Amino acid sequence: AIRDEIAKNTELSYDFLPLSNIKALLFFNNEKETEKFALERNWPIVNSKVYFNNQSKEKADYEDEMMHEEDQKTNIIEKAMDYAISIEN
Amino acid sequence: DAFRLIDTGALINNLEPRQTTSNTGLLNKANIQALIHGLNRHYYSLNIDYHKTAKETKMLMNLHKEQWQSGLKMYDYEEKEESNLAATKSMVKIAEQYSKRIEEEKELTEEELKTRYVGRQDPKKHLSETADETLENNIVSVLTAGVNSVAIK
Numbered sequence: 001a002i003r004d005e006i007a008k009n010t011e012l013s014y015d016f017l018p019l020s021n022i023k024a025l026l027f028f029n030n031e032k033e034t035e036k037f038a039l040e041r042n043w044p045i046v047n048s049k050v051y052f053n054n055q056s057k058e059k060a061d062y063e064d065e066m067m068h069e070e071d072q073k074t075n076i077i078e079k080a081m082d083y084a085i086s087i088e089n
Numbered sequence: 090d091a092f093r094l095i096d097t098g099a100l101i102n103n104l105e106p107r108q109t110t111s112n113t114g115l116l117n118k119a120n121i122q123a124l125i126h127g128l129n130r131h132y133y134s135l136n137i138d139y140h141k142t143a144k145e146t147k148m149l150m151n152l153h154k155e156q157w158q159s160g161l162k163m164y165d166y167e168e169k170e171e172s173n174l175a176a177t178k179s180m181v182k183i184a185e186q187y188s189k190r191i192e193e194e195k196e197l198t199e200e201e202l203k204t205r206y207v208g209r210q211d212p213k214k215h216l217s218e219t220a221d222e223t224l225e226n227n228i229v230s231v232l233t234a235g236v237n238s239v240a241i242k
Contacts, residue, residue, distance in 0.1 A: 080237045085232070088224075 003027075011052045018048050078089055095131035109136045163236055170233060181226045187218040 003026050010017070010025075010037060019034060026035045044051045065072050106112050111134045117125045126132060158165040195215060199206070 074241055078239075081231050081235050085228070 003037075007037075011055060017050055019045075019050060022050060048059065091133065091135045093133040094129075095133070096130040099131075106134060109134070143181070163239065167237060171237060184222055184226065191215045192219065 006026055010022075019031060020030070022038075023034045025030055026034075028037075037044055038050065042054055044053055063069075065076055069076065111132075114125065115121050119125070120128075124132070192215060195211065
């Protein structure tokens with residue numbers, strides 16, 4: 001659970017890090033096992049380097065018209081203007 | 090206005106006055122008040138109403154509002170109101186500047202809370218000037234702002 005908690009920090013705090021450091025930071029005994037943990041966490045791997053493209057987040061169960069919507073952005077801005085009119089009426 | 094003669098006759102008939110607001114003469118006051126009883130002759134007591142068909146009433150309701158921008162309200166007044174919005178933003182600021190200055194001098198000069206001041210309604214006049222004007226300036230910057238863009242794609 002500690003290594004999984006560190007993996008959440010390594011995404012934002014490390015833009016690019018090589019393979020040898022991930023083994024030393026998280027205390028791994030194998031380099032091949034190090035890349036196995038990156039597959040379950042969806043970490044892109046290149047030569048002698050490991051990037052993170054997962055910094056962008058989405059999904060997270062279901063949300064509608066809340067927390068940075070997609071196609072309702074234009075409407076909600078106009079909907080918020082129409083809510084104050086009915087309160088006065 | 091109208092006139093109709095009576096002279097002899099026209100009586101022994103239905104009820105002329107009972108129709109609309111007749112049987113009058115409190116003091117001398119009616120209509121132009123140059124008339125009293127006789128008017129021209131006999132107080133014909135004009136009654137002016139109007140009746141239209143279903144087609145005529147359907148016209149003036151939708152046709153007559155203020156002027157004709159109608160059928161599309163979006164772009165007609167969009168450019169005209171947006172071009173003066175820069176000057177409108179500066180003019181509405183002056184209205185707020187004179188708002189609190191009236192309420193500040195209102196409560197400063199009254200230590201009593203009684204009436205020697207012939208102030209029978211003092212607050213509601215200046216309170217509505219800071220409210221209705223504020224209520225006028227904000228709604229025209231919101232309801233019009235909703236259709237001021239509406240671009241989407």
